[PDB]
Amino acid sequence: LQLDEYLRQLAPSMTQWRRDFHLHAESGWLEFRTASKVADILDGLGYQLALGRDVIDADSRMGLPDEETLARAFERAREQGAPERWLPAFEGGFAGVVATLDTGRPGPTLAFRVDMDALDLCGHDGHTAIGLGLAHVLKQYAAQLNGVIKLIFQPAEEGTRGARAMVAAGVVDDVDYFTAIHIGTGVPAGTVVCGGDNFMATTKFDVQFSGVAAHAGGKPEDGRNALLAAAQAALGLHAIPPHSAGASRVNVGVMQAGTGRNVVPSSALLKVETRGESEAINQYVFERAQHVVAGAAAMYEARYELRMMGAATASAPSPAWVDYLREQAARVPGVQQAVDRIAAPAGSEDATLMMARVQARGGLASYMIFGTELDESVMAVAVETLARVALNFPWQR
Amino acid sequence: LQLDEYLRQLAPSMTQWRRDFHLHAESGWLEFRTASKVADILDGLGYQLALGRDVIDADSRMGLPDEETLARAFERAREQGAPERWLPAFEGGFAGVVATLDTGRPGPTLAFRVDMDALDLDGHTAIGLGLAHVLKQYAAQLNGVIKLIFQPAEEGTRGARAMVAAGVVDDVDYFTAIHIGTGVPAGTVVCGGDNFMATTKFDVQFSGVAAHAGGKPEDGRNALLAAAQAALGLHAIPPHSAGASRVNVGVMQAGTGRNVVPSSALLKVETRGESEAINQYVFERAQHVVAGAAAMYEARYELRMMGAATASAPSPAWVDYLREQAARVPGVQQAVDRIAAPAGSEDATLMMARVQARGGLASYMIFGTESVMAVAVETLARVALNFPWQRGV
Amino acid sequence: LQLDEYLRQLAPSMTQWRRDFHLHAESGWLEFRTASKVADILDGLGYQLALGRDVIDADSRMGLPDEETLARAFERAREQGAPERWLPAFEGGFAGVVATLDTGRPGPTLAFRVDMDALDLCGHDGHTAIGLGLAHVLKQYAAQLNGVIKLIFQPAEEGTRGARAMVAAGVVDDVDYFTAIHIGTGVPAGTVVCGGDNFMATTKFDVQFSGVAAHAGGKPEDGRNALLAAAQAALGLHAIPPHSAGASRVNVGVMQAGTGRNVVPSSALLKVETRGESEAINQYVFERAQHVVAGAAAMYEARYELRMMGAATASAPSPAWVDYLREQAARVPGVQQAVDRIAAPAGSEDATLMMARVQARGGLASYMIFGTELDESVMAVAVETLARVALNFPWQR
Amino acid sequence: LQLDEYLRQLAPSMTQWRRDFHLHAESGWLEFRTASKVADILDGLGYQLALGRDVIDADSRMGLPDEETLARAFERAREQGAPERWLPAFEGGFAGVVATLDTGRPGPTLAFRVDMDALDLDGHTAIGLGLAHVLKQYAAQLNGVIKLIFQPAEEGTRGARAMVAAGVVDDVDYFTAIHIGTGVPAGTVVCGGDNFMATTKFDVQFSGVAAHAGGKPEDGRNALLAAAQAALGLHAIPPHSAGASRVNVGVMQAGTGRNVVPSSALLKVETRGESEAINQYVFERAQHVVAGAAAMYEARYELRMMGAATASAPSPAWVDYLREQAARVPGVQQAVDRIAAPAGSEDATLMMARVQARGGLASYMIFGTESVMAVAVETLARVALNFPWQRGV
Ligand code: NA
Ligand code: NA
Ligand code: NA
Ligand code: NA
Ligand SMILES: [Y+3]
Ligand SMILES: [Y+3]
Known part of the structure; x- marks a missing residue:
C-alpha cells in the first residue's frame, strides 16, 4: 500500500547515492569508502550487519592489488569521508557487506545482490544505490515480510574476483531464493530480462x-x-x-x-x-x-x-523463479516488457557462482537485467520491481 | 703565453665547464642549457654561429621526445641558468651549434665534432670549448676554416643524421670526431676507431x-x-x-x-x-x-x-697524420690506428661517410681512461696548428 | 500392394550391387565404371537418362584430378567391365547420371539423390545400390505414381565437390520435393533421422x-x-x-x-x-x-x-517435408524410431547445395539418415522407406 | 718392376675397377656389390679383412634405409655379380671393409680412407684398390702396419660414426682421408683440407x-x-x-x-x-x-x-710430410696445405678427431680435377714407402 508513493519519497536519495558513489568510484578490492558508507546507512536503518573477513574468505580472493596499493586506497578513503566506525572492518581488501533483516515470522530467506566496484583505466555500476534503495523500502514495509531478507554488497565484480570469496565465506549457504541485478546498457530502455543466461x-x-x-x-x-x-x-x-x-x-x-x-x-x-x-x-x-x-x-x-x-x-536461472520474476516485473510502471530471456552478446559475471551454489543446495536463483539503452531513473523501476518480488512472495505455497 | 703556458692557464676554466655540464646534465634532444652556454662562450670568442634549425633538419630527427617533454625541459633549462639570449634558438628540440672560425686566408676546412647529451634512466663539450679557446688564441698560425660541431642526441644514435641533412659537413675537407674512451687504456689514443x-x-x-x-x-x-x-x-x-x-x-x-x-x-x-x-x-x-x-x-x-x-671506414692518410701528432703530445703513451674491442655504434659515422663521399678525409679519435681533457685539447690543437698547409696529406 | 513381398524379391540384387560397387570402388570424379553400370541398368528399366556434361556443369567442378589421372582411371574402367555404350558419356570427369520417370499424369516432381564416389587413401558409400533398388520399385508400381520422379546419382561427394556442378547444370531447378539419403554409421541401427541439420x-x-x-x-x-x-x-x-x-x-x-x-x-x-x-x-x-x-x-x-x-x-530441412518423411518412416519394418532430428557430431555434405536451391525456388527438401551402428541389409529398409515416400504422396492436397 | 713400371702395368686394372664401380654405382648403406668386390680383391692380395658388423657398430648408423630397401638392394647386388663368398657379411646395411697389412716388423700403423657410395635421386674405391696393390708389391720396404678403410655412406655424413664406434681407428698413428676434388685445379693437391x-x-x-x-x-x-x-x-x-x-x-x-x-x-x-x-x-x-x-x-x-x-683440424706436421711427398710426385703442380673454398661437411672428420684425440696425426688430402687416379696412387704410395721409420715426424 502506498508503495508507489513512498518510492517517489525516496528517489531524491538514490540519485544522490548514485552520484556520490560515481564521484568517489573505487576499483576492485579497493571499495573501502563505498562499503563504509553502505554499512553506515544500513546500520542506521537497523539491519544486522556482517562485514569484511566475516563475509569475504581471505584465501579465495583472486587478482588482489599489491600490499602497497591496498594501503593508499585505504588512507585515501579515510581522507575521502569514509566513516571511522566501519572503515577498519574492510582494511586489507575485505570491503564487503551483507545486511540481514529477520522478521521473526517463520519463512524463506530471500537474497538480493549488487556489486560496488568501478572499472580501472566508472560508468558501469550504479547498482549500489539501487541496493540501498531496496533496503529502505524493505524496512518501511517490514511488517508484510516473512522469513529473512539478505542484502549482499559485493566487491571486485569486474574481472570476476569477488563472488568466489563471498561464497567461500558461506554468504549464500542459507539462501532459498537468490536474485542478482544489473543495469543492462545493451538492453532496451524499459525492458527487463528476468533470466540472464548469456x-x-x-x-x-x-x-x-x-x-x-x-x-x-x-x-x-x-x-x-x-x-x-x-x-x-x-x-x-x-x-x-x-x-x-x-x-x-x-x-x-x-x-x-x-x-x-x-x-x-x-x-x-x-x-x-x-x-x-x-x-x-x-x-x-x-x-x-x-x-x-x-x-x-x-x-x-x-x-x-x-x-x-x-x-x-x-548461468542457468531457475525456471520457476524466473516466472515469478517475470510476473511481478510486468506490473511495475516503467516496465514495458518482461521478455524472460533475451539474445545479446555473451559475457561473464561472477554472480553466477552464488547462483550455482544456491542451486546446488536446493534454493532457486536468477539474474535480473534492467534496460536503459536509447534513463538514470531506471533505479526507481529496479527498486520497486525488487521490493515487489519480496512483498508479493507466496508465503503459504 | 706560447701554448704550453696557455693550456695551463686554461685548465681551470675547462674543469669549470666539465663540472657545470655534469651537474646540469641533459638528455638527448634536451640539451637546451648546454647549447646556450656553449653558444654564449663561443660568441664571446668571436666565433660565427649557426644554430638550431639552421643546422638540424627537423624531419631527419629520430627518437624525439613528445611536445610536453620538450617544453618542460626547455622551461627547466631557463630556470637553471641557460643564457636567455641564446635559449630561444633551440626551442623545440634543436639544441645544436656549429661555430666557424674563418682565418680569411686560403686553406682547407677542418671540422671537429663533440656531442652534448648524457644518458637516460659526455665530458666532450668542455673539450670542445677548450679547443675553441686555443684555436682563437693562435688564429694567426692557422689558414682556411675551422669548424666546431656540437652535436645533440648521440646516445641512441639519433642526432647526427639531422645535422648531415642540414649540410653541416658538406664543406668539410678534414673531419675528426672526438670521444673519451672508458674501455681504453689510460694513456692510449686510438686515431682510427672503427669498431x-x-x-x-x-x-x-x-x-x-x-x-x-x-x-x-x-x-x-x-x-x-x-x-x-x-x-x-x-x-x-x-x-x-x-x-x-x-x-x-x-x-x-x-x-x-x-x-x-x-x-x-x-x-x-x-x-x-x-x-x-x-x-x-x-x-x-x-x-x-x-x-x-x-x-x-x-x-x-x-x-x-x-x-x-x-x-666506420677511417681515411688512412688522415689517421696517420693524427697519430703522428698525438705521439708527440706529452700525456700520450700509445698513438695507435685501431684497437680491438666489442662492436658498438656511433652516428658520427654519418658525418664521416658524408665527408668521405664528397672527397674529404675523416677519422674517429678516442682518448683512453680527469686530466684526459688537457691532453685532448693539446692534441687536437696540434692537429690543427701543425697542418701541412702546403705539402698536405 | 505386395510391396513388402516384391522387396524380398529384390534384396538379392542390391547386395550384389553394394558388393560389386564396393569391389570396383572409384574416387571423386573418377566414378566412370559406376556411372556406366548405373546408366546401363537404369536405361534397361526404361528410364529417360541425362548424362555427363548435360548434368554436370564443367566450370563449377572443384578439386578435379589432373589430366593424367582422369585418363588412366577412364581406361581402367573400360578394362574393368564398364559398358561401352555409356562410358564415353563420362570421359573427362563427368561421371554423373539423372534418371527421369514421367507418369504423364499431372503432378509434382519428386527427386531422390545418392552419391557414387568412394574415399581416397571405401567403406562409406553403399548408397548407389539403394539408388538402383529404389529405381526398380518405382517402375513396378509406376501406375500408382503421378507427376515426375527423378533419381540423381552424384559424383565427388567426398570433399564436397560434385553437387555444385549438378546444381549449376540445373538438375534440381524443376524439383518440388527433394530427399537426400545416407547410411549413418554414427547413428543407432534401426533409427532413421528425417531431418539432418547437423x-x-x-x-x-x-x-x-x-x-x-x-x-x-x-x-x-x-x-x-x-x-x-x-x-x-x-x-x-x-x-x-x-x-x-x-x-x-x-x-x-x-x-x-x-x-x-x-x-x-x-x-x-x-x-x-x-x-x-x-x-x-x-x-x-x-x-x-x-x-x-x-x-x-x-x-x-x-x-x-x-x-x-x-x-x-x-542444412535447414523443410519442416513439413520432414514431418511427412517421419510419418512414412514409422510404418517401415526395420524402423524402430523416427526421431525427426538428432544430436550428433557436426559435418558437411554438398547435398545441402541442392536443398538450398530447391528451397529458394519454392520446393521443399530434407536429408534422410538410416542408422546401422552396433546390418548391411539396411538397404531394404531404406528402399522401402523411400519408395513409400513416393507412392504415399498426398497427390490431391 | 721397380715402381714406376708397376704403376704403368697397373693403370689398366685401375680404370677397369673405376668403370665397373661407376657402372654398378650404389647408394649409402647399400654398397653390397662394391664391398664384396673390394673384399674379394684384397683377400686375393693376402690382406687380413675385418668385415661388416666387426667394423660398423649397428646402433651408431644414421640415415639407414628401411628393411625392404636393404633387402632389395642386397638381392640386386647378388644378381649383378657380387662375389657370393663375401656378400653375406654385409647383409643388413653393413657394407664396410678394413684391410690390414702387418709387415711383422715394428713401426707405426698407417691408415688410408676411401668411401664407396654414390649419390641418390666416388672413384675413390679404385684408388684404394690400386694403393693396396702397390703396398703389397713393396711390403718389404715397409714397416709396422698398413690399414685400408673402405667406408660406406659418406654422402649425408652417415657412415664414419659407426666405424669409429667399432674401434676401426683406435690403433692408428697416422691417418689420411682421400678425396677427388672437382672444385680444385687440375694439378693441385690440397694436403690439409679443413673447409x-x-x-x-x-x-x-x-x-x-x-x-x-x-x-x-x-x-x-x-x-x-x-x-x-x-x-x-x-x-x-x-x-x-x-x-x-x-x-x-x-x-x-x-x-x-x-x-x-x-x-x-x-x-x-x-x-x-x-x-x-x-x-x-x-x-x-x-x-x-x-x-x-x-x-x-x-x-x-x-x-x-x-x-x-x-x-677438421689437420695435424700440421703430418700435412707437411704429405705435401713434401706430393710435390715430388710427377703429375702434381701445386702441393698446398689448405685452399679457400665454400664450407661443407665430411664425416672423415670423426676418424680424424678420434685419431688426434688418442695421440695420432691426421689430415685430409684432395686431388684436383681421368688420370687423377694414377697420381693419387703414386702419391699415397710414396707417403707410405718414404716414411721416416726412424726420424719420424
Ligand atoms: Na559491475
Ligand atoms: Na654521448
Ligand atoms: Na559419400
Ligand atoms: Na662419397
Ligand atoms: Y498508490
Ligand atoms: Y504384404
Missing part, C-alpha cells in the same frame, strides 16, 4: 615468463628469449581448438616484454582469459592453455609462473 | 580494431597477434653472406585489457650490420616482415625511425 | 607458396622461405577468432614444404578447410583466412596461389 | 591424436601446429659468439587429410657450426625447441639422427 564460464590468469641468461657476459648463446616464448605462447593460446558441445573463447588481452631495444628480452608477461558456454567447456580450454604456456616456456628453456586472477561459471 | 657497426633502430606500432573478447570476437583485429608473428619473423631473418648482422625485438607492449581484443601493439626493434649494405639488407627484410604481419590481421602499421648510424 | 557450411582450398630466390648462387640473403611463410600461415589460420552467431571451424589438414634437408625451402603447400554453422559464419571465416595467407606470403616476400577445392552450405 | 664445418642432421617426428576437424576438434592434438611452431623456434635460435652457425628446416610433411586434425608431422633439420662446440650448442638448443613445441600440443616426439660430422 553468461559464459571463464578463467582469468596471468603468465610470467623468465629467461635468466645462462651466464653473464651477455653472449647470445646464453640468452633465453622470454619475449619470443610468450609470442609463441600467444599464438598457441589463440589456436586452441573449439569444442563440439558449445561456444568457447580465449583472449590474450595484454603482453609486456623486454627492458630495452638492443637488449635480449629475459622477462615477459601475459594477461589471458578463457571462456566456455558451459563449465566443462571452459575447463577444457583452460587445460589446453596450461599445456601451451608450459611448452612455450620449455622451447626457450625459460621458466614460467601461473597466477589465477579470477573466475566465474555458467 | 662501429651500421645500425637501424625503429618502432613499429600496429593498429587494429578493439572488440569485446567474449561478446563479439569477429569484430576484432588483433594487433597483438600481428606483433607476435612479426616478432617471430624478425628473428628468423636469414644472415648475409658478406658478414655479421643481427635483429633484435627488444620490447613488446600490446593490449588494453584482459577481456578486450588488443587493437594496439608496439615493437621496439634494432637492426645491426657489419657493413652499410648488410644493415640495409636486414632492415629491408624487416620492413617486409612487419608489413605482412600487419596485413595478416588487417591491421594498420606505422614504422618510426628511432636511430641510425653506418659503418 | 551440417555446416564449408569452404575447401589449397594454398601454394612460392619463394623463388632473388638471385642465383644460393646466398642466404637471397632466399625467401616458403616453409616459414606457410608455418606462420598455419598458425594464423588456426588463430582466426570464433563468431558470436554460432560455431565455426578451421583446419589445415595438410602441409608439404621443402626439397632437401640442407636446402632453403622455396616451395610450400597447404590444404585447408573452413566451416561455420551458417553460410554467413563460414563466409566470415574464409574472408579472414585469405587475409592470413596473403600477409604470411608478404612477410617472406613470397608469392601465393589460392585454389578452390570444394564447398557446401548449411 | 668442413661440424654438423648434425636429424629428423623430428611429431605424434599427436587424429580427430575429425569439424565433428570433434577438442579430441585433436595437432602435430602439424607443433612442427610449425618448432620450425619457427628453430630458425630463431641465437647465433654463437665464437663463430658461424646455422639451422635449417629443409623439409616439413604433415597431415593425413583436409578434414582431419594432423596427428603426424615430420621435420628434416640440419644444424651447422664453425666448431664442434658451436654445433653442439645449436643442436642442444634445437632439442629444447622441439621438445617444447611437442609439449605445447601434448604431442609425442622422436628425434632420429640422420647424419653427423665434426670440424
